């Protein structure tokens, strides 16, 4: 289940300063390459509680965090990315994505 996903490891320090939302990583499918690709995410912290802590820019695949995190509250989030073409066709299967909450730094 790797397909054509390209994803850097994702960590986010707790107690971050804004401005929010803030870029974490840019998620990519190389069918992009042979089309425009459109990205979404699911999982706890995305579409299930706590909802909307992480969002993704549909056209660019920038995964962003929307507010400060607290390692003592949630230390890891498991999310899933999805990719489709302009014709609506799925160009990848879902990819499980770990986000690790780390030491604060004033970035």
């Amino acid at each position: 289940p790797l397909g054509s996903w390209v994803i850097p490891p994702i960590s986010c320090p707790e107690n971050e300063k804004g401005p929010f939302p803030k870029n974490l990583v840019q998620i990519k499918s190389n069918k992009d390459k042979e089309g425009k690709v459109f990205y979404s995410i699911t999982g706890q912290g995305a579409d299930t509680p706590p909802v909307g802590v992480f969002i993704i820019e549909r056209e660019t695949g920038w995964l962003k965090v929307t507010e400060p995190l607290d390692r003592e509250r949630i230390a890891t989030y498991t999310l899933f990315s999805h990719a489709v073409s302009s014709n609506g066709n799925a160009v990848e299967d879902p990819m499980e994505i770990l986000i690790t909450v780390t030491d604060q730094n004033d970035n």
Partner: protein, 462 residues
């Protein structure tokens, strides 16, 4: 504002969800329990995010509020905020607010978060001159003239709007972090005034001239991904940069990067690069992206011993062996290249994601001991064998080897040929210049699973 006498909580807060929340805040047992103005006058903060609130009717009687979080709700009207002049911080991202006129006299505000709404006219922000944090992304804003007097702003984000004209930023010299990504910006000349900038994020715009950045020497983070950059000579001046994203542009000349030795992350994918010699000294790098260029010789990568993430896919690379010294690598992507010998990859003992499809790989044995792998890509290999003589009957050894060292039987064989291990044989009545075969074998290495598949072309010489 005051309630004349004691009133049931569900008569003040008419919103079902907000009534519940306020029952807990106000220490009562149910929503129909009566409350006094003096009880209301105790509430100074309110965390009410993510509760399905549609109306904040009632909030006006909470006279002493200084901080509120109504993010991630279904708010439209925010009229009840109008007189709450002790408010210092408001979190209200992810609602359906269209009219922010009720914010206009909240002059003690130092933080205002309104991203992901339906805001167009920000004129009501104009007198909020104590603001040091302002977040307006994902709205439909095209005019930022209302920002021009916000001279205490340190952090400002209006990404994902329809802004063309940045001139209103000119006097905001206290800005330290700015994000203008996904607007309609070509001219960033006003940014030369913002000499305190530490972070500038400006992805997905129409920027070709970055000369205005030359004096922004306090920049440690810079993102110009998805623009029209070619000449990046100005970046040589930015000696404090540690994180630089230049992906999706038209850059070929990387010489201006070479003195940028603080860099720990550098994205250069989707450009016009054929020479990475200027990257050789950037030895603090942990992440390097070079996908979608015109690279063949990647020898200058060999010194970057701190790399844990590297992308090389969509290039013209045959020799992958410069990665052999990058023993900290945890993820390596090189799909769509011309690599056949992966012997060097046996060294990458901590490798977890290995993406190698659409190369010329025929033998998986050098990967056999890479047991930390959790994601693996080996599909769609293709190569052309050295020619062999055309004859009435032609036989070649099969050379596709699994991780176990066992030959993988062909899946299909052209021209009605057949397999008897280890030889593929064709009966060829008439001269043909080539024959071929395919293979397709699921495989797992450690916990990483893929289909090792490909097409092998065998030229026949006469």
């Amino acid at each position: 504002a005051t309630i004349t006498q004691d009133t049931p909580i569900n008569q003040i807060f008419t919103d079902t969800a907000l009534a519940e929340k306020m029952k807990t805040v106000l220490g009562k047992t149910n929503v129909t329990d009566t409350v006094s103005q003096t009880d209301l006058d105790q509430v100074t903060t309110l965390q009410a995010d993510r509760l399905g609130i549609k109306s904040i009717d009632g909030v006006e009687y909470l006279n002493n509020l200084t901080q509120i979080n109504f993010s991630n709700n279904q708010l439209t009207d925010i009229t009840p905020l109008k007189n709450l002049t002790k408010l210092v911080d408001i979190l209200m991202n992810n609602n359906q607010i269209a009219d922010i006129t009720p914010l206009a006299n909240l002059t003690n505000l130092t933080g205002l978060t309104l991203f992901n709404n339906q805001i167009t006219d920000i004129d009501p922000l104009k007198n909020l001159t104590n603001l040091n944090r302002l977040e307006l992304s994902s709205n439909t804003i095209s005019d930022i003239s209302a920002l021009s007097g916000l001279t205490s702003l340190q952090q400002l984000n209006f990404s994902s709007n329809q802004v063309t004209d940045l001139k209103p930023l000119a006097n905001l010299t206290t800005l330290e972090r700015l994000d203008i990504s996904s607007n309609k910006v070509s001219d960033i000349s006003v940014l030369a005034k913002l000499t305190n900038l530490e972070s500038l994020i400006a992805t997905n715009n129409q920027i070709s001239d970055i000369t205005p950045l030359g004096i922004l020497t306090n920049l440690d983070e810079l993102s110009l991904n998805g623009n029209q950059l070619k000449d990046i000579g100005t970046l040589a001046s930015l000696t404090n940069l540690t994180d630089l994203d230049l992906a999706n542009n038209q850059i070929s000349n990387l010489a201006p990067l070479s003195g940028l030795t603080k860099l720990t992350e550098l994205k250069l994918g989707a450009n016009q690069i054929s020479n990475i010699s200027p990257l050789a000294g950037l030895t603090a790098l942990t992440n390097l992206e070079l996908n979608e260029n015109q690279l063949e010789d990647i020898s200058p990568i060999s010194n970057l011993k701190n790399l844990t993430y590297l992308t090389l896919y969509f290039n013209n690379i045959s020799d992958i062996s410069p990665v052999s010294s990058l023993t900290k690598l945890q993820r390596l992507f090189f799909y769509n290249n011309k690599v056949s010998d992966v012997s060097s990859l046996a060294n990458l003992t901590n490798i977890n994601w290995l993406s190698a499809g659409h190369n010329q790989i025929s033998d998986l044995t050098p990967l056999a001991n890479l047991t930390r792998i959790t994601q693996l890509g080996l599909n769609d290999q293709a190569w052309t064998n050295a020619p062999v003589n055309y004859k009435a009957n032609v036989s070649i050894p099969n050379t596709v080897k699994n991780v176990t060292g066992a030959l993988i039987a062909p899946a299909t064989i052209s021209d009605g040929g057949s397999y008897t291990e280890p030889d593929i044989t064709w009966n060829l009545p008439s001269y043909t210049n080539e024959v071929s075969y395919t293979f397709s074998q699921p495989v797992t290495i450690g916990k990483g699973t893929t289909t090792f598949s490909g097409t092998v072309t065998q030229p026949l010489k006469a």
